[PDB]
Amino acid sequence: DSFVIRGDEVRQIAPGQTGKIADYNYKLPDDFTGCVIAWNSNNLDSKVG
Amino acid sequence: SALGKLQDVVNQNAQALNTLVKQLSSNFGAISSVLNDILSRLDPPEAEV
Numbered sequence A: 001d002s003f004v005i006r007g008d009e010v011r012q013i014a015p016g017q018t019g020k021i022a023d024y025n026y027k028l029p030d031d032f033t034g035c036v037i038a039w040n041s042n043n044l045d046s047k048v049g
Numbered sequence B: 001s002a003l004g005k006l007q008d009v010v011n012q013n014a015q016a017l018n019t020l021v022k023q024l025s026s027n028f029g030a031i032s033s034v035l036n037d038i039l040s041r042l043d044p045p046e047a048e049v
Helices: A006-013 B004-025 B035-040
Strands: none
Touching: none
């Protein structure tokens, strides 16, 4: 599964989390088996304006 | 006190049932002894614990 989120929201991509990305964008189950790999992509996804 | 042998058996069974029923009021480390209050207040990730 792949997506772009804000850095403060990286912690929400985990089982048992609450917020806007967890409760409304990408909810993970509590018995989730897997890995949440994430990296800073400011050099790819940022624009001046 | 002549029929104490039979009364003692009745009393022991009554105490055993009263003890078993009273154990439902114990929290056992949970936030509440009432299962309905836990399910009314919590979502599954905390309610299951």
